[PDB]
Amino acid sequence: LQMIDVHQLKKSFGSLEVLKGINVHIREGEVVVVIGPSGSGKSTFLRCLNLLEDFDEGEIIIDGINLKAKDTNLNKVREEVGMVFQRFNLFPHMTVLNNITLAPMKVRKWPREKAEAKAMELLDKVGLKDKAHAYPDSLSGGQAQRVAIARALAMEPKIMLFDEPTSALDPEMVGEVLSVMKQLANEGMTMVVVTHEMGFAREVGDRVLFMDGGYIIEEGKPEDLFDRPQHERTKAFLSKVF
Numbered sequence: 001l002q003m004i005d006v007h008q009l010k011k012s013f014g015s016l017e018v019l020k021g022i023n024v025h026i027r028e029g030e031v032v033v034v035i036g037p038s039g040s041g042k043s044t045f046l047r048c049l050n051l052l053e054d055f056d057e058g059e060i061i062i063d064g065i066n067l068k069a070k071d072t073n074l075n076k077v078r079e080e081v082g083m084v085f086q087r088f089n090l091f092p093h094m095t096v097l098n099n100i101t102l103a104p105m106k107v108r109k110w111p112r113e114k115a116e117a118k119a120m121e122l123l124d125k126v127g128l129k130d131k132a133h134a135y136p137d138s139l140s141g142g143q144a145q146r147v148a149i150a151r152a153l154a155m156e157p158k159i160m161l162f163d164e165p166t167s168a169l170d171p172e173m174v175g176e177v178l179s180v181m182k183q184l185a186n187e188g189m190t191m192v193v194v195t196h197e198m199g200f201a202r203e204v205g206d207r208v209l210f211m212d213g214g215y216i217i218e219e220g221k222p223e224d225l226f227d228r229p230q231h232e233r234t235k236a237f238l239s240k241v242f
Contacts, residue, residue, distance in 0.1 A: 001063065001064055002027055002063075003026055003028045004049065004060075004062060004159065004190075005025055005059075005060070005061040005062075006022055006023060006025070006060050007058050007060075008021055008058035009045070009048065009055055009057065009058040010022075010058055011041070011053070011057075011214075012056055018041040018044045018214055019041045019045060019048070019055070019214045021214070021215065022045060022214070024045075024216070026192065027190075028158070028190050029189075030190055030191075031191045031193070031206045032191065032193070032209060033194075033201040033205040033208050033222070034046075034193065034208075034209045035194075035195070035196070035201070035208065035209070035211070035237075036210055036211035036212050036237065037212065039213070040211040040213060041211060041213070042211050043164075043194065045211070046163050046194060047163075048060060049081065049192070050078075050083055050161060051067060051072075051077045052083075062080055063159070078155060079108075080157055081157050081158075082153060082155055082157035082160050082161065083152060083162075083163065084149050084162045084163070085148075086164040087168055088141075088165075090137075090144055090148065090151075092136045092137035093135075095132065096123065096133070097119055097120070099151060100119040100123070100147070100150055101115040101119045101154065103151070104118070104119075104154045104155055118154065118156075119150070119154055120132060122154060123150055125153075125180070126146040126147070126149055127146065127176070128143060128147060128150070131143065140173060141169045141170060141173050142169060142172075142174075142177060143176075145165055145166070145177050146176065146177060146180055149165075149177070149184075159189075159192070160191050161191075161192050161193075162191065162192070162194065162195065163194050164195055165177055165195070166178060166197060178197060178199075181204070182203075182204050193205070198226065201222050202222040203222075205222045206221070207221060208220060208221070208222050208226075210234050210237065212233055212237065217231055217233055217234055
């Protein structure tokens with residue numbers, strides 16, 4: 001069954017309509033990158049996928065879960081979808097390990113021993129097994145975002161959403177975060193990534209979605225869309241390149 005099934009999605013904020021008819025179908029293991037100019041509705045789209053934002057029209061089904069069914073709720077969605085934001089936030093009151101096991105222990109009711117063992121495995125995956133007992137306030141931006149990825153993964157979601165996770169990071173800390181995302185892509189995680197790092201997009205992305213004014217103008221493999229943009233305003237966007 002499709003991991004992400006979006007049909008005629010429409011979203012409006014007052015008289016402002018951010019999404020005006022989106023259709024997206026992502027299957028398991030796919031790494032989909034979304035690009036476009038500000039105000040395109042990239043972030044709004046993502047937040048609709050995991051109940052952070054509501055929508056006006058169309059339907060969204062995440063791994064079988066219709067987001068508007070009456071028996072759907074935040075915890076049910078959180079069990080399937082994880083999210084990483086541009087601006088990460090950790091609790092310095094508790095250790096990195098405790099920041100990670102918090103959600104799984106509360107929601108999935110896993111015993112602390114079980115949760116901590118899985119958490120240690122995730123810290124090793126993101127390259128910070130030596131920070132398990134450190135507190136988040138001693139971490140640099142690059143480390144904190146990797147811990148946040150680890151935290152998002154602790155819920156063992158089937159889908160990982162990234163909303164420009166490196167745009168707020170210093171250039172020297174971007175690589176380490178992208179590296180973890182790349183590994184996650186290789187492990188087969190279903191991913192939707194909103195980013196400006198075209199390098200990552202071409203070498204790790206399976207498909208690219210170009211968003212412009214609440215619409216999905218062009219779709220295609222990274223190399224095809226970046227090198228030979230079939231549509232009009234696609235060429236224009238790419239041309240203002242960097």
